[PDB]
Amino acid sequence: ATYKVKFITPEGELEVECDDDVYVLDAAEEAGIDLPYSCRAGSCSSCAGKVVSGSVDQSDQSFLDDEQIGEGFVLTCAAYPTSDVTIETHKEEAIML
Ligand code: FES
Ligand SMILES: [Cl-]
């Protein structure tokens, strides 16, 4: 399966295709979109986003509190789409402060 990932970025809204076993960040980078990252391993705040519609599988992530996952935050370097999904990007600040 291949899913449509819609990114809501501070610059605007863009959609890419992302295979079901490709991390969202990597589909963005493969499309020419520069989204932030640092560890690329699921253990930092840098690539954080917020799921506003649909679902992901981000069981390879460790950094987020279940409160944080329950509120919709996702680590894009560690999240597979499981449906068409819309993600607000550049939410590092919100999962620190
Ligand atoms: S870049 Fe560190 S968790 Fe994604
Ligand atoms: Cl879907």
Numbering used by the authors: 2 to 98
Q: What does the study report here?
A:
In our current work we have identified the outer membrane receptor responsible for ferredoxin and pectocin import in Pectobacterium spp., which we designate FusA. To understand the mechanism of ferredoxin import we have solved the crystal structure of FusA and two of its plant ferredoxin substrates, and using nuclear magnetic resonance (NMR)-driven molecular docking we have modelled the FusA–ferredoxin complex. The discovery of FusA demonstrates that, like their mammalian pathogenic counterparts, phytopathogenic bacteria can use a TBDR to specifically target iron-containing host proteins. In summary this study reports and the structural characterization of a TBDR receptor that binds to iron–sulphur cluster containing ferredoxin domains.
To probe the interactions between FusA and its ferredoxin substrate, using NMR, we expressed and purified 15N-labelled, ferredoxin domain from pectocin M1 (PM1fer), and ferredoxin isoform 2 from Arabidopsis thaliana (NP_176291) (Ferara). Titration of purified FusA into 15N-labelled Ferara resulted in a decrease in the intensity of the 15N heteronuclear single quantum correlation (HSQC) spectral peaks that was proportional to FusA concentration, suggesting formation of a 1:1 complex in an intermediate to slow exchange regime. We solved the crystal structures of Arabidopsis ferredoxin isoform 2 and potato (Solanum tuberosum) ferredoxin isoform 1 (CAC38395) (Ferpot) and performed docking with extracellular portion of the FusA structure using the programme HADDOCK22. Docking solutions formed two major clusters in which the ferredoxins docked with the extracellular pocket of FusA, with the C terminus either pointing up and away from the FusA barrel or at right angles to it. The C-terminal up solution was favoured for both ferredoxins. In this solution, the ferredoxin molecule is positioned directly over the pore of the FusA barrel and forms extensive interactions with the β-wall formed by loops 4, 5 and 7, and the plug domain loop of FusA. To investigate this we tested purified leaf ferredoxins from potato isoform 1, maize (Zea mays) isoform 1 (ACG46956) and Arabidopsis isoform 2, which share 70–75% sequence identity, for their ability to enhance the growth of a panel of Pectobacterium isolates. Arabidopsis ferredoxin enhanced the growth of 14/17 strains, while potato ferredoxin enhanced 9/17 strains, with a noticeably weaker overall effect. On the basis of our docking experiments, a number of the amino-acid differences between the three ferredoxins occur at the FusA–ferredoxin interface.
